[PDB]
Design a protein around this ligand. Structure first.
Ligand SMILES: O=C1O[C@H]([C@@H](O)CO)C(O)=C1O
Ligand SMILES: O=C1O[C@H]([C@@H](O)CO)C(O)=C1O
Ligand code: NA
Length: 163
Protein backbone atom coordinates (compact mmCIF):
# COMPACT_ATOMS: atom_id res chain seq x y z
CA UNK A 1 0.00 0.00 0.00
CA UNK A 2 2.70 2.48 -1.35
CA UNK A 3 6.48 1.60 -0.89
CA UNK A 4 8.07 3.28 2.23
CA UNK A 5 11.11 5.49 1.63
CA UNK A 6 13.13 6.69 4.61
CA UNK A 7 15.98 9.24 4.42
CA UNK A 8 18.94 8.88 6.79
CA UNK A 9 20.71 12.27 6.76
CA UNK A 10 24.16 12.88 8.23
CA UNK A 11 27.68 14.25 7.52
CA UNK A 12 28.99 10.59 7.70
CA UNK A 13 32.49 12.03 8.26
CA UNK A 14 33.36 9.26 8.28
CA UNK A 15 30.77 6.50 8.45
CA UNK A 16 31.20 4.34 11.62
CA UNK A 17 30.09 0.86 12.70
CA UNK A 18 27.22 2.61 14.53
CA UNK A 19 25.85 4.16 11.33
CA UNK A 20 26.22 0.76 9.58
CA UNK A 21 24.13 -0.90 12.34
CA UNK A 22 21.44 1.77 12.09
CA UNK A 23 21.17 1.58 8.27
CA UNK A 24 21.04 -2.27 8.37
CA UNK A 25 18.22 -2.12 11.05
CA UNK A 26 16.32 0.47 8.96
CA UNK A 27 16.71 -1.51 5.69
CA UNK A 28 14.71 -4.37 7.39
CA UNK A 29 11.75 -2.12 8.19
CA UNK A 30 11.31 0.19 5.15
CA UNK A 31 11.16 -0.62 1.38
CA UNK A 32 13.87 2.01 0.53
CA UNK A 33 16.62 3.63 2.64
CA UNK A 34 18.48 6.76 1.35
CA UNK A 35 21.85 7.46 3.03
CA UNK A 36 21.72 11.25 2.58
CA UNK A 37 25.21 12.81 2.98
CA UNK A 38 25.05 16.49 3.82
CA UNK A 39 27.73 18.15 1.65
CA UNK A 40 28.63 20.81 4.27
CA UNK A 41 29.61 24.01 2.39
CA UNK A 42 29.65 26.49 5.34
CA UNK A 43 30.87 23.57 7.62
CA UNK A 44 34.25 21.80 7.14
CA UNK A 45 34.08 17.99 6.66
CA UNK A 46 37.43 16.15 6.99
CA UNK A 47 36.44 13.79 4.07
CA UNK A 48 35.08 15.11 0.76
CA UNK A 49 31.56 14.18 -0.45
CA UNK A 50 33.12 11.65 -2.87
CA UNK A 51 35.23 9.98 -0.17
CA UNK A 52 32.18 9.85 2.22
CA UNK A 53 29.87 8.37 -0.42
CA UNK A 54 32.50 5.75 -1.36
CA UNK A 55 33.10 4.76 2.26
CA UNK A 56 29.33 4.45 2.78
CA UNK A 57 28.78 2.34 -0.45
CA UNK A 58 31.73 0.13 0.49
CA UNK A 59 30.12 -0.62 3.93
CA UNK A 60 26.40 -0.78 2.91
CA UNK A 61 26.22 -1.43 -0.91
CA UNK A 62 25.57 -5.20 -0.24
CA UNK A 63 22.08 -4.03 0.97
CA UNK A 64 20.02 -3.89 -2.24
CA UNK A 65 17.37 -1.45 -0.87
CA UNK A 66 19.96 1.30 0.13
CA UNK A 67 20.79 4.39 -2.05
CA UNK A 68 23.57 6.94 -1.42
CA UNK A 69 23.05 10.61 -2.30
CA UNK A 70 24.77 13.91 -1.42
CA UNK A 71 22.50 16.88 -0.55
CA UNK A 72 22.53 20.45 0.65
CA UNK A 73 19.90 23.04 1.52
CA UNK A 74 16.89 22.53 3.77
CA UNK A 75 16.29 18.91 4.87
CA UNK A 76 12.53 19.54 4.33
CA UNK A 77 13.09 20.44 0.62
CA UNK A 78 15.16 17.26 0.17
CA UNK A 79 12.42 15.31 2.05
CA UNK A 80 9.79 16.60 -0.47
CA UNK A 81 12.06 16.12 -3.55
CA UNK A 82 12.73 12.52 -2.39
CA UNK A 83 9.02 11.81 -1.65
CA UNK A 84 10.15 10.36 1.71
CA UNK A 85 7.83 8.64 4.22
CA UNK A 86 10.17 9.75 7.05
CA UNK A 87 13.57 10.88 8.18
CA UNK A 88 15.47 8.44 10.37
CA UNK A 89 17.88 9.57 13.15
CA UNK A 90 19.90 7.61 15.74
CA UNK A 91 19.65 8.88 19.38
CA UNK A 92 22.90 8.30 21.32
CA UNK A 93 22.74 10.73 24.27
CA UNK A 94 20.17 13.07 25.98
CA UNK A 95 21.40 16.23 24.07
CA UNK A 96 20.81 14.31 20.79
CA UNK A 97 17.26 13.64 22.06
CA UNK A 98 16.47 17.33 22.93
CA UNK A 99 17.96 18.69 19.67
CA UNK A 100 16.15 16.04 17.55
CA UNK A 101 12.82 16.73 19.34
CA UNK A 102 13.17 20.48 18.48
CA UNK A 103 14.17 19.79 14.80
CA UNK A 104 11.32 17.36 14.24
CA UNK A 105 8.77 19.96 15.46
CA UNK A 106 10.39 22.79 13.46
CA UNK A 107 10.41 20.61 10.29
CA UNK A 108 6.73 19.58 10.89
CA UNK A 109 5.91 23.31 10.98
CA UNK A 110 7.76 23.90 7.65
CA UNK A 111 6.10 20.78 6.06
CA UNK A 112 3.08 19.15 7.75
CA UNK A 113 3.88 15.84 5.89
CA UNK A 114 7.36 15.68 7.53
CA UNK A 115 7.95 12.69 9.86
CA UNK A 116 10.97 11.66 11.95
CA UNK A 117 11.54 8.17 13.43
CA UNK A 118 14.33 7.38 15.81
CA UNK A 119 16.45 4.30 16.56
CA UNK A 120 18.67 3.85 19.67
CA UNK A 121 22.08 2.22 19.11
CA UNK A 122 22.98 -1.33 20.37
CA UNK A 123 25.12 -0.81 23.46
CA UNK A 124 28.32 -1.99 21.62
CA UNK A 125 28.06 1.17 19.32
CA UNK A 126 26.52 3.55 21.87
CA UNK A 127 29.96 5.25 22.70
CA UNK A 128 30.95 5.73 18.97
CA UNK A 129 30.65 9.05 17.06
CA UNK A 130 32.34 10.37 13.85
CA UNK A 131 33.87 13.29 15.94
CA UNK A 132 35.54 11.02 18.49
CA UNK A 133 36.85 8.68 15.73
CA UNK A 134 38.41 11.70 13.86
CA UNK A 135 40.10 12.66 17.10
CA UNK A 136 41.57 9.21 17.84
CA UNK A 137 42.76 8.87 14.18
CA UNK A 138 44.26 12.40 14.22
CA UNK A 139 46.28 11.46 17.37
CA UNK A 140 47.38 8.15 15.68
CA UNK A 141 45.06 5.88 17.72
CA UNK A 142 43.72 2.66 16.21
CA UNK A 143 40.06 3.10 15.10
CA UNK A 144 39.75 -0.42 13.62
CA UNK A 145 37.27 -1.56 16.30
CA UNK A 146 34.84 1.41 15.61
CA UNK A 147 34.73 1.70 11.79
CA UNK A 148 34.84 -0.44 8.67
CA UNK A 149 38.30 -1.42 7.36
CA UNK A 150 37.80 0.86 4.32
CA UNK A 151 37.60 3.88 6.74
CA UNK A 152 40.76 2.71 8.54
CA UNK A 153 42.59 2.75 5.14
CA UNK A 154 41.08 6.17 4.25
CA UNK A 155 42.61 7.62 7.47
CA UNK A 156 46.11 6.23 6.37
CA UNK A 157 45.63 7.80 2.86
CA UNK A 158 44.45 11.09 4.49
CA UNK A 159 47.74 10.83 6.62
CA UNK A 160 50.01 9.84 3.60
CA UNK A 161 48.52 12.65 1.42
CA UNK A 162 49.31 15.14 4.33
CA UNK A 163 48.38 14.78 8.12
O1 LIG B 1 26.67 11.09 10.18
C1 LIG B 1 26.96 11.62 11.24
O2 LIG B 1 28.12 11.52 12.15
C2 LIG B 1 27.67 12.02 13.44
C3 LIG B 1 27.86 11.07 14.67
O3 LIG B 1 26.90 11.20 15.73
C4 LIG B 1 27.72 9.63 14.39
O4 LIG B 1 27.72 8.97 15.65
C5 LIG B 1 26.24 12.32 13.12
O5 LIG B 1 25.29 12.46 14.04
C6 LIG B 1 26.06 12.41 11.83
O6 LIG B 1 25.21 13.08 11.13
O1 LIG C 1 37.25 -6.05 7.65
C1 LIG C 1 36.25 -5.50 8.12
O2 LIG C 1 36.07 -5.07 9.47
C2 LIG C 1 35.34 -3.86 9.28
C3 LIG C 1 34.50 -3.46 10.51
O3 LIG C 1 33.26 -4.01 10.15
C4 LIG C 1 35.00 -3.88 11.93
O4 LIG C 1 35.30 -2.73 12.74
C5 LIG C 1 34.63 -4.09 7.97
O5 LIG C 1 33.72 -3.46 7.26
C6 LIG C 1 35.08 -5.10 7.41
O6 LIG C 1 34.51 -5.65 6.36
NA1 NA D 1 23.15 0.35 17.05
Amino acid sequence: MSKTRVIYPGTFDPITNGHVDLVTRASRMFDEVVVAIAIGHHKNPLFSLEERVALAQSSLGHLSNVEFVGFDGLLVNFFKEQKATAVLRGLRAVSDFEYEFQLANMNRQLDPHFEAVFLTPSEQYSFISSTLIREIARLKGDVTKFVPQAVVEAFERKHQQGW
